[PDB]
Amino acid sequence: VNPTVFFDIAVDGEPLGRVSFELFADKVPKTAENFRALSTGEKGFGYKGSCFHRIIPGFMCQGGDFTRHNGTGGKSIYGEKFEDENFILKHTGPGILSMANAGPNTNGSQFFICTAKTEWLDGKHVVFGKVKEGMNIVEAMERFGSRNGKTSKKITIADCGQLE
């Protein structure tokens, strides 16, 4: 029942591989639906063509800023921001998909894929999905990050949509 969404990842325009995510629509329906719709683009805007602007190896890969491409932009399907839905799910290890924000109830479109357990984020960031296939591709993406988060090559979502 939970939707599966895919990203095709490119590195300076070269196809790298595919990551798919299960979205926990059973537990965070409003948050999962925002990401699902942004991945299909069915509302007229979304993640296709956007970049991962911040990659910190051993911590996380951050993306979803499709309007300013640098961490200052993005927007949800529900308006500029929306509320923290709940904190049922925790940051239990690599592969967790969680919402970036700017304080309480400031979710937009930015997200991060954890590449480590990040328990200090529990109760502050809304967890809403997990990598299903292609964790090895995320690990490959990590090699283009750096300590301050700047990437050495342009990491883009070349295509994205729903699988199931």
Tab-separated table of C-alpha atoms in Angstrom:
chain	number	residue	atom	x	y	z
A	1	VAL	CA	0.000	0.000	0.000
A	2	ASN	CA	2.878	2.402	0.751
A	3	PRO	CA	4.017	4.200	-2.413
A	4	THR	CA	7.455	3.639	-3.894
A	5	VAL	CA	9.146	6.561	-5.641
A	6	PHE	CA	12.345	6.498	-7.678
A	7	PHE	CA	15.156	8.951	-8.429
A	8	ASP	CA	17.553	8.488	-11.330
A	9	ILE	CA	20.824	10.134	-10.238
A	10	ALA	CA	23.323	11.774	-12.588
A	11	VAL	CA	26.826	13.111	-11.922
A	12	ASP	CA	27.658	16.034	-14.244
A	13	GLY	CA	24.980	14.716	-16.615
A	14	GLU	CA	26.266	11.129	-16.664
A	15	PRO	CA	23.737	8.512	-15.480
A	16	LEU	CA	24.850	7.063	-12.140
A	17	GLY	CA	21.997	4.826	-11.044
A	18	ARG	CA	18.559	4.554	-9.494
A	19	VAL	CA	17.421	4.896	-5.881
A	20	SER	CA	13.918	3.931	-4.838
A	21	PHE	CA	12.210	4.953	-1.607
A	22	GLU	CA	9.285	3.548	0.281
A	23	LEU	CA	7.188	6.358	1.748
A	24	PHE	CA	5.463	5.633	5.070
A	25	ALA	CA	2.066	6.941	4.009
A	26	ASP	CA	0.479	4.773	6.701
A	27	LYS	CA	2.250	6.765	9.440
A	28	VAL	CA	2.852	10.243	7.957
A	29	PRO	CA	0.233	10.623	5.195
A	30	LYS	CA	0.496	14.393	4.712
A	31	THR	CA	4.306	14.357	4.596
A	32	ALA	CA	4.543	11.278	2.371
A	33	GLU	CA	2.028	12.701	-0.112
A	34	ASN	CA	4.014	15.937	-0.451
A	35	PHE	CA	7.150	14.013	-1.435
A	36	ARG	CA	5.214	11.617	-3.683
A	37	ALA	CA	3.543	14.422	-5.622
A	38	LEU	CA	6.797	16.347	-5.953
A	39	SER	CA	8.448	13.205	-7.372
A	40	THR	CA	5.774	12.648	-10.044
A	41	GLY	CA	5.481	16.364	-10.756
A	42	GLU	CA	1.732	15.858	-11.150
A	43	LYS	CA	0.991	19.301	-9.632
A	44	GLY	CA	3.165	21.134	-12.183
A	45	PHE	CA	6.384	21.447	-10.158
A	46	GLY	CA	8.698	19.092	-8.322
A	47	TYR	CA	12.055	17.435	-8.071
A	48	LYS	CA	12.842	16.524	-11.682
A	49	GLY	CA	16.051	18.274	-12.737
A	50	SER	CA	16.898	19.578	-9.248
A	51	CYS	CA	20.208	18.990	-7.507
A	52	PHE	CA	21.617	17.658	-4.222
A	53	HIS	CA	23.197	20.845	-2.939
A	54	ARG	CA	24.744	19.549	0.295
A	55	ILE	CA	26.458	16.175	0.763
A	56	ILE	CA	28.380	15.474	3.982
A	57	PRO	CA	29.996	12.006	3.922
A	58	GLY	CA	29.177	9.937	6.974
A	59	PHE	CA	26.157	12.126	7.731
A	60	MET	CA	23.629	12.777	4.967
A	61	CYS	CA	22.737	13.872	1.443
A	62	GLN	CA	20.434	16.903	1.235
A	63	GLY	CA	18.333	17.982	-1.714
A	64	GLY	CA	14.906	19.159	-2.790
A	65	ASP	CA	15.592	22.896	-3.268
A	66	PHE	CA	14.183	23.098	-6.775
A	67	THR	CA	13.683	26.898	-6.812
A	68	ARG	CA	17.078	28.263	-5.674
A	69	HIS	CA	19.243	25.114	-5.901
A	70	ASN	CA	21.282	26.017	-2.810
A	71	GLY	CA	19.263	25.271	0.337
A	72	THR	CA	17.358	28.563	0.558
A	73	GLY	CA	14.303	27.641	-1.501
A	74	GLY	CA	11.700	25.020	-2.322
A	75	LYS	CA	8.004	24.786	-1.539
A	76	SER	CA	5.486	22.122	-0.613
A	77	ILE	CA	2.311	21.152	-2.447
A	78	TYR	CA	0.397	22.669	0.505
A	79	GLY	CA	1.953	26.125	0.259
A	80	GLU	CA	5.261	27.626	1.239
A	81	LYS	CA	5.500	25.610	4.461
A	82	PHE	CA	3.577	23.002	6.394
A	83	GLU	CA	3.458	21.623	9.889
A	84	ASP	CA	5.430	18.868	11.553
A	85	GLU	CA	2.989	15.992	11.168
A	86	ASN	CA	4.313	13.735	13.954
A	87	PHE	CA	7.560	12.202	15.191
A	88	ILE	CA	6.446	8.558	15.299
A	89	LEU	CA	9.480	7.412	13.312
A	90	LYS	CA	13.084	7.868	14.382
A	91	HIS	CA	16.471	8.309	12.682
A	92	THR	CA	17.602	4.718	13.172
A	93	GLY	CA	20.388	4.380	10.592
A	94	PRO	CA	21.528	4.830	6.998
A	95	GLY	CA	18.795	5.074	4.394
A	96	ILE	CA	16.298	7.094	6.459
A	97	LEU	CA	14.464	9.858	4.576
A	98	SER	CA	13.670	12.915	6.706
A	99	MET	CA	12.444	16.479	6.211
A	100	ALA	CA	14.713	19.493	6.317
A	101	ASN	CA	13.167	22.544	7.950
A	102	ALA	CA	13.937	25.936	9.485
A	103	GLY	CA	12.438	25.512	12.948
A	104	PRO	CA	9.109	24.119	14.161
A	105	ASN	CA	6.485	23.674	11.455
A	106	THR	CA	8.594	24.891	8.519
A	107	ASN	CA	8.607	21.937	6.180
A	108	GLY	CA	8.791	22.694	2.468
A	109	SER	CA	10.374	20.435	-0.130
A	110	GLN	CA	13.928	19.908	1.154
A	111	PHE	CA	14.778	16.509	2.544
A	112	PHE	CA	17.810	14.494	3.457
A	113	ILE	CA	18.870	10.885	3.084
A	114	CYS	CA	20.763	9.808	6.180
A	115	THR	CA	23.977	7.874	5.633
A	116	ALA	CA	24.473	7.269	9.368
A	117	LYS	CA	22.369	6.950	12.509
A	118	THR	CA	21.419	10.533	13.464
A	119	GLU	CA	19.515	10.153	16.753
A	120	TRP	CA	20.007	13.795	17.742
A	121	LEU	CA	17.514	14.691	14.999
A	122	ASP	CA	14.695	12.646	16.604
A	123	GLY	CA	11.710	14.804	17.535
A	124	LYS	CA	13.047	17.716	15.458
A	125	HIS	CA	12.851	16.389	11.884
A	126	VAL	CA	9.938	14.376	10.494
A	127	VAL	CA	10.972	10.916	9.257
A	128	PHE	CA	8.790	9.762	6.374
A	129	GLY	CA	10.519	7.138	4.242
A	130	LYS	CA	13.465	4.865	3.715
A	131	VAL	CA	15.675	3.713	0.858
A	132	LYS	CA	14.315	0.473	-0.571
A	133	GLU	CA	16.702	-0.210	-3.466
A	134	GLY	CA	19.950	1.438	-4.441
A	135	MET	CA	21.555	2.213	-1.111
A	136	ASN	CA	24.774	1.523	-3.012
A	137	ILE	CA	23.965	4.460	-5.301
A	138	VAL	CA	23.530	6.746	-2.283
A	139	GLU	CA	26.892	5.518	-1.038
A	140	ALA	CA	28.325	6.387	-4.439
A	141	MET	CA	26.796	9.883	-4.193
A	142	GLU	CA	28.622	10.327	-0.898
A	143	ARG	CA	31.973	10.181	-2.559
A	144	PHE	CA	31.235	13.502	-4.298
A	145	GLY	CA	30.578	15.353	-1.034
A	146	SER	CA	32.983	17.057	1.352
A	147	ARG	CA	33.320	18.057	4.991
A	148	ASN	CA	31.595	21.414	4.485
A	149	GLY	CA	28.905	19.900	2.225
A	150	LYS	CA	30.019	21.347	-1.112
A	151	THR	CA	29.931	18.762	-3.875
A	152	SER	CA	32.785	18.254	-6.319
A	153	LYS	CA	30.457	17.419	-9.165
A	154	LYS	CA	26.880	18.351	-9.934
A	155	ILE	CA	24.535	15.683	-8.544
A	156	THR	CA	21.119	15.881	-10.170
A	157	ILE	CA	17.819	14.063	-10.158
A	158	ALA	CA	17.682	13.429	-13.910
A	159	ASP	CA	14.305	11.702	-13.701
A	160	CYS	CA	11.907	10.721	-10.945
A	161	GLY	CA	8.437	9.318	-10.488
A	162	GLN	CA	6.338	6.635	-8.903
A	163	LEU	CA	6.958	2.910	-9.277
A	164	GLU	CA	4.107	1.517	-7.137
